[PDB]
Amino acid sequence: AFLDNPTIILAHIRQSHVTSDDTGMCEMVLIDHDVSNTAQRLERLRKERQNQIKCKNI
Amino acid sequence: NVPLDLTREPSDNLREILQNVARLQGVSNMRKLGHLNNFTKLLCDIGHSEEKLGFHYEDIIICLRLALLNEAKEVRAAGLRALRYLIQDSSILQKVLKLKVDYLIARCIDIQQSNEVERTQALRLVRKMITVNASLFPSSVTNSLIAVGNDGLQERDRMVRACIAIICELALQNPEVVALRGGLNTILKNVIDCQLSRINEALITTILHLLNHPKTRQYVRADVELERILAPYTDFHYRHSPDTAEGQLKEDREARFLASKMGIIATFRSWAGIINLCKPGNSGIQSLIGVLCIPNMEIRRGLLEVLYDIFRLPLPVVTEEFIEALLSVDPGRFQDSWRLSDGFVAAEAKTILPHRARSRPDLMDNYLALILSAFIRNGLLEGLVEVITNSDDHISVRATILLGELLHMANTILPHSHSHHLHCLPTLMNMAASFDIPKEKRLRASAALNCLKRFHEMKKRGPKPYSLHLDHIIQKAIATHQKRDQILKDTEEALLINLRDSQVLQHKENLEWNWNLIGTILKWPNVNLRNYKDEQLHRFVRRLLYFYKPSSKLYANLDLDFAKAKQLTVVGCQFTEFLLESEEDGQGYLEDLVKDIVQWLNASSGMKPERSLQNNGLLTTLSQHYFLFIGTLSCHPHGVKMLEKCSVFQCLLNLCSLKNQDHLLKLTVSSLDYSRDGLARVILSKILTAATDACRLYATKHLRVLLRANVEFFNNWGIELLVTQLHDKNKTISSEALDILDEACEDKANLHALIQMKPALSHLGDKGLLLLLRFLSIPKGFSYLNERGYVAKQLEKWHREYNSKYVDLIEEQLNEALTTYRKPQRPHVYLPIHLYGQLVHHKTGCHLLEVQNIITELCRNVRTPDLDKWEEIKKLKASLWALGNIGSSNWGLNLLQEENVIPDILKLAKQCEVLSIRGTCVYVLGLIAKTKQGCDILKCHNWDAVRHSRKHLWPVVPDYIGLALPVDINDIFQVKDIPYFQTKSFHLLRQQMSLTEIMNTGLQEHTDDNCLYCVCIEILGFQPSNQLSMCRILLRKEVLRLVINLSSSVSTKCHETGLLTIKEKYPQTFDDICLYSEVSHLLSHCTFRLPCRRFIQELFQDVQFLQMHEEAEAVLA
Amino acid sequence: QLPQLTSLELQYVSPKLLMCRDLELAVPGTYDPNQPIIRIQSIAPSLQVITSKQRPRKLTLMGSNGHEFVFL
Ligand SMILES: Nc1ncnc2c1ncn2[C@@H]1O[C@H](COP(=O)(O)OP(=O)(O)OP(O)(O)=S)[C@@H](O)[C@H]1O
Ligand SMILES: [Zn+2]
């Protein structure tokens, strides 16, 4: 086969990604016009730390 | 919100960006996004220019980059969208990159904070950035995209493919920034977990494109990057992902096998992959053959599927006996397309009957011969023999069939020197003849040889007509060809004995008769009811007649797929022909039978008011074979007279008009005989001119069945029918007729018949012009087109425009053939018609071509190639194809050897840097070898060619098919090596000193440039940074060393907990933007995993950055 | 992929050990100057790896006198 020039390669990439992507995104992203877990961890550590420090270690 | 669109643009946009900056107080997000939409509309309707806008670009950028820090996803998406509409030149992008806004975009990409609309605008913006200027792409967004595509499948991210597509689009215009941050590795490791064929091939094509040109070939390692795709096969215990679910371990293995197969059979379709996998060193093709010779019944059974679909061969069924898998690869096996509803006879004739072209190049054969030679050079036959002997039966049968197919392909597409010592099979014959080895190996080798001979017999048998209409068609054609150019008596005794043992007269119970004896009593030479006047014979005939009549409802009711259904139809055909054999005594029966058939046909067609719909019985019972009886009755001259005595032809003429039943037209168009002129051609012409569009299409497609079957006098009426079909209102019918004409024009007797009736082939597409160009190939027609000023009008047209469009045409054909591109089993890639090839044929247009001085410029272009841009490579390809079409005959080698250009092409086919033209040169050198003088010229330069044509299957070793191959296939696989482009204090104090005890600037790589805020102080007159509340210089370098240690991914939990405790204890250390700038510059230059990167970016989320917003609002007004 | 290693083929791991078929070396560990030496004739083409922390292979040669010498 002859897929060597960047134009045919670009067209192939765009069409193959657009048509054969089950999930929505590809057609939305490849429009040809232009051609929290840390908060949960912080909450857990905050609540734990208040209970945690109640004693003195020598 | 509140748009006016009628005011001073400066004051309006100033109010807009002031409300945008919002001073971080008293402004809601909804009104801010409304103002952002207003600014987008203002930028749309009013052109962007620093004069008509009233403000410089820097102010717009500094007021727009603050919407990316907004907490609302809608405002962030609106800011990204409004920033995309601003980037329209290289200067705007350069200024957007001077301020470190790429940090904010890379941040907006990798949050996955329940926002699949805000992350789409970011990718659209980076695509616009790549489009505007790809030589300035920042490394931050590059690293972000690489991290998303590298570890996005495990985190269930839904933007994986959308990021890999952008990475591949970026690697075409800026490969250094993608190879530096390790993007090519992401691409290559993303093809082994991609089951989708089109995406897998679009991913492998960019890697195979970087290896094509040298300037990009410097960005790929030697034997470790491309050869990764065949690691699942070469590595018996292959682990792709380091951390995967232990529940799925076999499904993962099958997915890896499927993806690796789809990538391996996709690198062998490109020249940059063929050359790079078959290099003369320790290549990746020898590692694929070597692991085939290891008794591992899991890898060995999976490599055979790749070998089968590499050579485009059909797979046999999974069995243990050779005689059952040999039957499944029969070229004539039934297919679903051959059913009456789908493709009744026209699709069946295409498969079994051969093409009319016996000298066309058929580039597919060239490609397959090159691949087969490259595989034989590295020892594939020895590996196949070792698989045949020392393996299981399930794999032995499949390897024996593959070896048989390869051995048959060898003596068909390979030059004699390449295939005159392959049929010896020394390693198998020495094993089958050695009585020292164990007897099991000897016996299985002998069995393999026997199976190979059986396969060869099957191959030299040929495909046979599966159906009963095509069988009669071919038999009638053969009989006509035989009779155009030039047994026992059984008087009274044996006849009566055979009539007695048949059991027809003993009892009238059907399905219990001896049908073999009936067939032989009907087919015996001199038994014709005209010389043997016996009452028992008349009883026999009357009983068979009453059985075969449809009104009796005896034969017309048996369903298809019956135990003995073909035999009953054959016996009926020879019976209605035996009745015709008695022209004076067989009227009372034949007339009755045909009249009953006409009654049934008029009742089932809809010529009655009872039901007018009987398709439920014709389609599922043997009553549809009553068209075969009329078919075998219309061949004989005395048959058509009897057929016209009854209203048969009028019945078909009336049936041609209806619109509800399309199967009846298929049945009547594939049953009648059109050998002689009469009422049989009128029905065909009526169906071809005035009928249903689908029926008309099938009728015009049923002309290959009359062409490939070599029906006599086809050039008289078939050519005229195709010419009148070219004027059809429907477009698909016209294109099909054009294709049939292009195939029929391969015979000179047919091209002379087409020229004698000058058609109008100019008002059609490119196919019509390519068909009309064939007229020049012969003087009678070339001299005709030359008078009306058509050759000189086409010469300059092909010189300026269509020489570079022919290469696009042939590349499109090759791609549609074997790359699964589909521009908006093995096919036949026949070479398109080239004007230069037609002008050289008759020595009169040859001089007309030589006086134009066209060979000199083409020779000069081939001798002085640019090989730097992609337009000059296109021009070199066009020149090579033109020179190869010129040297397709003996009058072209004369004016082609005066310049001595063939050595230049032969040297370009083995020393060029670009590999696509190195394959184009192979195709052109093959095309050169269509004549004896061409092969003689090529032999002096050590290039063999096939000296036989496509006329005979087994030609005796002493116009041709164009195929040329080097004597040593490793000559064109030499690539010049290009070196890789890479070869061209507190951290120790923290080890022994803790944090609480040390409590009783810190930015290493921080300058005025590369800081989000500090860049503005000189350009936009920002007020200098305030002094923070040595108590804070320590925590700064502490969080810096923590985020540095978080990069090794060795112990991420400890550093994450440390960062969390630092955020909990001092929530103000994550407020200085001069630290966020540093950590973002660190993210833009290191390899962080996706979860760690998301955590780091989320640490700085609930921050205010009040001073920058205040200074932006101050410098604004 | 270390727990999956439970057998080794000589065609895959070391293609030079299974193509000896004769040697002048004596079988390791068995040589005394007062006895006829036993030469290494062949090597079995398959090794079994013992599932442990160090994974010791189970080599088995074939001496010139027709007796199998199993090693570790
Ligand atoms: N299934 C059948 N197949 C052939 N004939 C049948 C069948 N069923 C009934 N028949 C009758 O058999 C007739 C043909 O027999 P003839 O040629 O007249 O020989 P035949 O022996 O004189 O018949 P008959 O009944 O003795 S007068 C048919 O036309 C029907 O009358
Ligand atoms: Zn700074």
Taking the C-alpha atoms of residue B529 and residue B519, their distance in angstroms, rounded to an integer, is 15
Q: Does the beta carbon of B539 lie under 8 angstroms from any beta carbon of chain C?
A: no
Torsion angle (degrees, nearest 10) of CA B355, B357, B359, B360: -90
CB within 8 Å: A12 and B811? no
Three-state SS string over B242-280 comes to: CCCCCCCCHHHHHHHHHHHHHHHHHHCCCHHHHHHHCCC
Quick one: closest CA in A to B1092, which residue?
A38
Query: What region does C49 belong to: left with phi over 0, alpha with psi -120 to 50, or beta?
Result: beta
* Cα–Cα distance for residue pair B915/B918, rounded to 1 Å: 5
Give the burial class of B64: count Cβ atoms within 10 A of its Cβ; 0-12 exposed, 13-18 middle, 19 or more buried.
Answer: buried
Nearest to B366 by CA among A1, C38, A5: A1
3-state secondary structure (DSSP) of residue C39:
strand
Annotated binding site of C for ATP: 52, 54, 72
- CB-count exposure of residue B690 (10 Å: 0-12, 13-18, 19+): exposed
Contacts of residue B565, defined as CB under 8 A and 6 or more positions apart, other chains included, come to B558, B622
Q: What is the CA radius of gyration of chain C?
A: 14
Q: What's the CA gap between B1024 and B819, in Å, rounded?
A: 60
| Order of strands, sheet of C60-63, starting from the edge strand that comes earlier in the sequence | C40-43, C60-63, C68-70
Report the C-alpha gap between B269 and B367 in whole angstroms: 9
- What are residue C26's DSSP bridge partners? C39
Distance between CA B445 and CA B432 in Å, rounded?
5
The three-class DSSP label of residue B550 is: coil
CA distance B342 to B331: 19
Residue found under tokens 């996004």: B33
d(CA B197, CA B826): 18
Q: Which residue has the tokens 């691409």?
A: B187
Distance spanning both ends of chain A, measured CA to CA: 77
Kindly report the number of other CB atoms within 10 A of residue B598's CB atom: 19
Ligand 1 binding pocket mutation candidate from B502, B543, B552, B575 (most atoms within 8 A of CB): B543
**B887: closest CA among B816, B945, B829, B813?**
B945
Residues 6 or more apart in contact with residue B288 via CB below 8 angstroms: B230, B233, B234, B264, B303
Q: Which amino acid is present at B325? A: A
- Taking the C-alpha atoms of residue B1032 and residue B624, their distance in angstroms, rounded to an integer, is 95
User: Can you list the pairs that B733-740 forms with residues at least 24 positions away whose Cβ atoms lie under 8 Å?
Assistant: B733/B693, B733/B696, B733/B697, B733/B700, B734/B764, B735/B767, B736/B697, B736/B700, B736/B701, B737/B700, B738/B764, B738/B767, B738/B768, B738/B771, B739/B767, B740/B700, B740/B701, B740/B703, B740/B704, B740/B707
Q: Scanning every residue of chain B, which has its alpha carbon at the shortest distance from the alpha carbon of C5?
A: B237
User: How many angstroms separate the CA atoms of B371 and B363, rounded?
Assistant: 12
Experimental method, per PDB record? cryo-EM
Least CA distance to A42: which residue of chain B?
B1060
As a whole number of Å, the end-to-end CA separation of chain B is 23
DSSP reduced 3-state for B862? helix
Ligand 1 in reach of B1105 Cβ (< 6 A): no
Tokens representing B350 are 């295409």
Which two tokens mark B844?
């009169």
List of E strands, B833-985: 943-945, 964-966
Cα–Cα distance between B605 and B618 in angstroms, integer?
Answer: 10
Per-residue H/E/C for B1057-1087: HHHHHHHHHCCCCCCCHHHHHHHHHHHCCCC
Q: How far apart are CA B1093 and CA B291, in angstroms?
A: 41
Rounded to 5°, angle at Cα B14 from B9 and B15: 105
Residue B234, phi then psi, degrees to nearest 5: -75, -25
Structure tokens given for C19: 């193509």
Q: Where are the beta strands (DSSP E) in B383-481?
A: none
Check if the beta carbon of residue B695 is closer than 8 Å to that of residue B662.
Answer: yes
Q: Which residues pair with B966 in a beta bridge?
A: B943
**Helix, coil or strand: residue B334:** coil
CA distances from B87 to B66, B77, B633 (A): 17, 16, 78
What's the one-letter identity of residue B110?
D
Backbone angles phi, psi at B1113, to 5 degrees: -65, -30
Query: Distance of alpha carbon B193 from its chain centroid, rounded?
Result: 21
Q: d(Cα B587, Cα B604) in Å, to the nearest integer?
A: 25
Count CA within 13 A, CB hemisphere, residue B518.
Answer: 23
**Strand, helix or coil for residue B242:** coil
Residue B147 vs residues A25, B47, B305, C56: alpha-carbon distances, Å? 18, 37, 35, 40
> Distances in Å between the alpha carbon of B779 and those of B462, B774, B798, B1016?
38, 11, 21, 79
Containing H/E element for B1038?
A: helix B1033-1045
- Beta-carbon separation of A36 and B1101 below 8 A: yes
| Sole residue written with tokens 């840097």 | B913
Q: Find out whether B820 and B201 touch, Cβ atoms under 8 Å.
A: yes
Cα C16 from Cα C34, distance rounded (Å): 32
Closest ligand, as measured to the CA of B506: 1
Classify B299 as helix, strand or coil: coil
C-alpha to C-alpha distance for B1005 and B1077, rounded to whole angstroms: 10
Exposure on the CB side of residue B1010, measured as CA atoms within 13 A: 16
B433, B590 in Cβ contact below 8 A?
no
How far from chain centre, in Å, is Cα B591? 55
**Coil, strand or helix at B672:** coil
How far does Cα B1037 stand from its chain's mean position?
A: 56
Q: With contacts defined as CB-CB under 8 Å, which chain B residues touch A12? A: 201-202, 205, 821
Q: Which two tokens stand for residue B545?
A: 């007649």
Q: How many Å lie between the alpha carbon of B1033 and the closest alpha carbon of chain C?
A: 47
Single-letter code of the amino acid located at B54:
G
Q: How far is CA A5 from CA B16, B209, B263, C46, in A?
A: 45, 8, 20, 50
Using CA coordinates, name the residue in chain B closest to C10.
B294
d(CA B967, CA B959): 22
H/E stretch holding C9 reads: strand C7-9
Pocket test for ligand 1, best of B503, B505, B508, B534 (most atoms within 8 A of CB): B508
Residue B1025: nearest ligand to its CA?
2
Would you state the structure tokens that stand for residue B107, as one six-digit string? 């941040």
Residue B108 vs residues B73, B103, B145, B646, B1078: alpha-carbon distances, Å: 10, 9, 12, 84, 17
Distance of alpha carbon B1028 from alpha carbon B586, whole angstroms: 119
Q: B373 with B839: CB under 8 angstroms?
A: no
Chains that touch B (3 or more CB pairs under 8 A): A, C
Q: What is residue B391's three-state secondary structure? A: coil
For ligand 1, say whether the CB of B557 is within 6 Å of any of its atoms: no
Residues 6+ apart with CB under 8 A from B729: none
Strands C60-63 and C68-70 come out as antiparallel
Q: Is A48 on the interface with B (CB under 8 A)?
A: no
Decide whether any atom of ligand 1 lies within 6 Å of the B512 Cβ: no
b vs e for B127-143, b when ≥16 Cβ sit within 10 Å of the residue's Cβ?
bbbbebbeeebbbbbbb
Interface residue of B241, B294, B386, B387 to substitute, partner C, most C CBs within 10 Å? B294
Distance CA C18, CA C62 (A): 12
Looking at the DSSP bridge assignments, the partners of residue C43 are C61
CB burial of B1026-1062 (b: ≥16 within 10 Å; e: otherwise) equals eeeeeebeebbbbbbbbbbbbbeeeebeebbebbbeb
Q: Report helix, strand or coil for B50.
A: coil
> Looking up tokens 């490609």, which residue turns up?
B367
DSSP chain A: ----SHHHHHHHHHHHHHHT-SSTHHHHHT-TT---HHHHHHHHHHHHHHHH--S---
Q: Are B375 and B413 in contact (CB under 8 A)?
A: no
Tokens of B506: 């003993």
| Coil, helix or strand at residue B1012 | coil
Q: Which of B238, B239, B294 sits opposite C11 (nearest CB)?
A: B294
Report d(CA B107, CA B110) in Å as an integer: 6
Token pair recorded at residue B616: 């439920």
> Distances in Å between the alpha carbon of B301 and those of B124, B297, B307, B393, B947?
45, 6, 10, 11, 37
Alpha-carbon span B259 to B193, nearest angstrom: 6
| Residue C48, helix vs strand vs coil | strand
Please check whether residue B892 is in contact with residue B845, taking contact to mean a CB–CB distance below 8 angstroms.
no
Can you tell me the distance from the alpha carbon of B803 to that of B101, in angstroms, rounded to the nearest whole number?
48
Instruction: Return the SS3 of B150.
Output: helix
Mutate to test the interface with A, among B198, B262, B269 (most CBs of A within 10 A): B198
Q: Which ligand is nearest to the CA of B549?
A: 1
Structure tokens at B1003: 């930015």
**CA atoms within a 13 Å half-sphere pointing along the CA-CB vector of B652:** 27
Q: Is B542 in the pocket of ligand 1 (CB under 6 A)?
A: yes
* Chain A contact set for B1058 (CB, 8 A): none
Distance CA B1035, CA B1066 (A): 9
**B483-to-B470, B581, B715 alpha-carbon distances in Å:** 20, 18, 20
How far apart are alpha carbons B759 and B744 in whole angstroms?
15
Q: Round to whole Å and give the CA distance between B360 and B679.
A: 37
Q: What is the DSSP string of B946-969?
A: ----SS-SSPPP------EEESSG
C-beta B124 within 6 A of ligand 1: no
Query: Is residue B547 lining ligand 1, measured as CB closer than 6 Å?
Result: yes
**Single-letter amino acid, residue C58:** K
The secondary structure of B305-331 as a DSSP string is: HHHHHHTTPPP--S-S-HHHHHHHT-T
The answer to whether B719 touches B330, Cβ cutoff 8 Å, is no
Name the residue among B712, B741, B713, B709 with its Cα closest to residue B725.
B741
CB atoms within 10 A of CB B91: 10
DSSP assignment string, B853-907: T-HHHHHHHHHS---SSSHHHHHHHHHHHHHHHHTTSHHHHHHHHTTT-HHHHHH
Three-state secondary structure readout of B786-821: HHCCCHHHHHHHHHHHHHHHHHHHHHHHHHHHHCCC
CB atoms within 10 A of CB B370: 23
CA distance B192 to B725: 50
Q: How far is the CA of B1015 from the centre of ligand 2 (A)?
A: 8
The one-letter amino acid at B688: L
Q: Are the C-beta atoms of B406 and B313 separated by less than 8 Å?
A: no
Put the strands of the sheet holding C57-58 in their side by side order: C7-9, C46-49, C57-58
Identity at B162, one-letter amino acid code: A
> B232 forms bridges with which residues in the sheet?
none
Q: At what angle do helices B915-928 and B871-886 cross, to 10 degrees?
A: 10
**Total residue count of chain B as it appears in this document:** 1117
CB B364 within 8 A of CB B371: no
Helices (H) and strands (E) in chain C, counts: 1, 6
Cα gap B684→B679, rounded to integer Å: 9
Supply φ then ψ for residue B956, to 5 degrees.
-70, 135
| DSSP secondary structure letter of residue B226 | G
- In single-letter form, the type of residue at position B671 comes to S
Helix then strand then coil, in percent of chain C rounded to 5, is 5, 30, 65
| 3-class state of residue C62 by DSSP | strand
